[PDB]
Design a protein around this ligand. Structure first.
Ligand SMILES: [N-]=[N+]=N[C@@H]1[C@H](O)[C@@H](CNS(=O)(=O)NC(=O)CCCC[C@@H]2SC[C@@H]3NC(=O)N[C@@H]32)O[C@H]1n1cnc2c(N)ncnc21
Length: 266
């Protein structure tokens, strides 16, 4: 709505750089662009042209051709979200562990906005694999894409984004009760949390898996998992394995899923 536009001041690039670039911080480069097609596509293009995108941060005020998992889109309007992509060098890490990098990102996003909520409503946590939920609504979506030797981590976090603007099952910090969300503070918290989780992932820290399970909305729930190819599997989510894959209990049989869409059942 037009009223929410007043609640959407521009990001401060200079200030974010002062806070996030320098001693004690792994981020080497940060840019805020007014608009782009897809921040993920941009960092992928940079890498494909020889640039070292490790520790590089790209933030867009607006994204006109956003991308979701397996061919889907991501909708946004100007200054209503935190829209960023991050480059991570991964070649030094075994390929089996790359799946955990995306789980780590969602954990970082959740922890960056969790205390801003007045009281924990039902369904505030992480849905496997790339979903930050709050009150059942999708608060943020994570997209990891490969460009050797890097992985580009993308985050779309609904700050003041109205569900009617993007998606019916969406929610935002504003629609959760946060009156005047400051994207500068939130982005700063987010990238600081993200830095910690990436280091943890890179060093195979046990705390990463433990912290994920503690915030998982999926583990322990009856779920319908829509597999790639259109097949549905119904069971009970039990655990995450060492590759970040979802372990399903289907009537006593174990089904391990590497990718798919999860729906929490009654
Ligand atoms: N159901 N469905 N429909 C929409 C779409 O089909 C679906 C896609 N979700 S998804 O397949 O699990 N993928 C994701 O959640 C990952 C999205 C990553 C976006 C980030 S933003 C910066 C970076 N650059 C990119 O191009 N992508 C990444 O989410 C719905 N959707 C679109 N915009 C949304 C909304 N702003 N908030 C919540 N949900 C919404």
């Amino acid at each position: 709505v037009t009223d929410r536009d007043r609640l959407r001041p521009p990001l401060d690039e200079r200030s974010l750089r002062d806070q996030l670039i320098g001693a004690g911080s792994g981020w080497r480069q940060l840019d805020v662009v007014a608009q782009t097609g897809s921040t993920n596509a941009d960092l992928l293009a940079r890498a494909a042209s020889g640039a070292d995108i490790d520790g590089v941060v790209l933030i867009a005020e607006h994204q006109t051709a956003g991308r979701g998992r397996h061919g889907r889109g991501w909708a946004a309007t100007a200054r209503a979200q935190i829209i960023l992509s991050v480059g991570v060098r991964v070649v030094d890490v075994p390929v089996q562990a790359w799946g955990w990098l995306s789980l780590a990102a969602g954990l970082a996003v959740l922890d960056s906005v969790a205390p801003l909520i007045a009281v924990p409503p039902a369904e505030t946590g992480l849905k496997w694999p790339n979903d930050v939920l709050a009150r059942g609504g999708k608060l943020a979506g994570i997209l990891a894409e490969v460009a050797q030797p890097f992985v580009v981590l993308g985050v779309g976090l609904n700050v003041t984004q109205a569900p009617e603007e993007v998606d019916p099952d969406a929610t935002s910090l504003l629609d959760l009760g946060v009156a005047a969300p400051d994207r500068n503070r939130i982005a700063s918290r987010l990238l600081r949390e993200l830095e910690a989780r990436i280091i943890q992932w890179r060093n195979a820290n046990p705390q990463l898996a433990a912290d994920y399970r503690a915030r998982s909305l999926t583990i322990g729930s009856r779920v319908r998992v829509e597999l790639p190819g259109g097949q549905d599997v119904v069971g009970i989510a039990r655990d995450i394995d060492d590759q970040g894959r979802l372990c399903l209990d289907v009537g006593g049989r174990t089904v391990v899923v590497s990718a798919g869409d999860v729906v929490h059942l009654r």
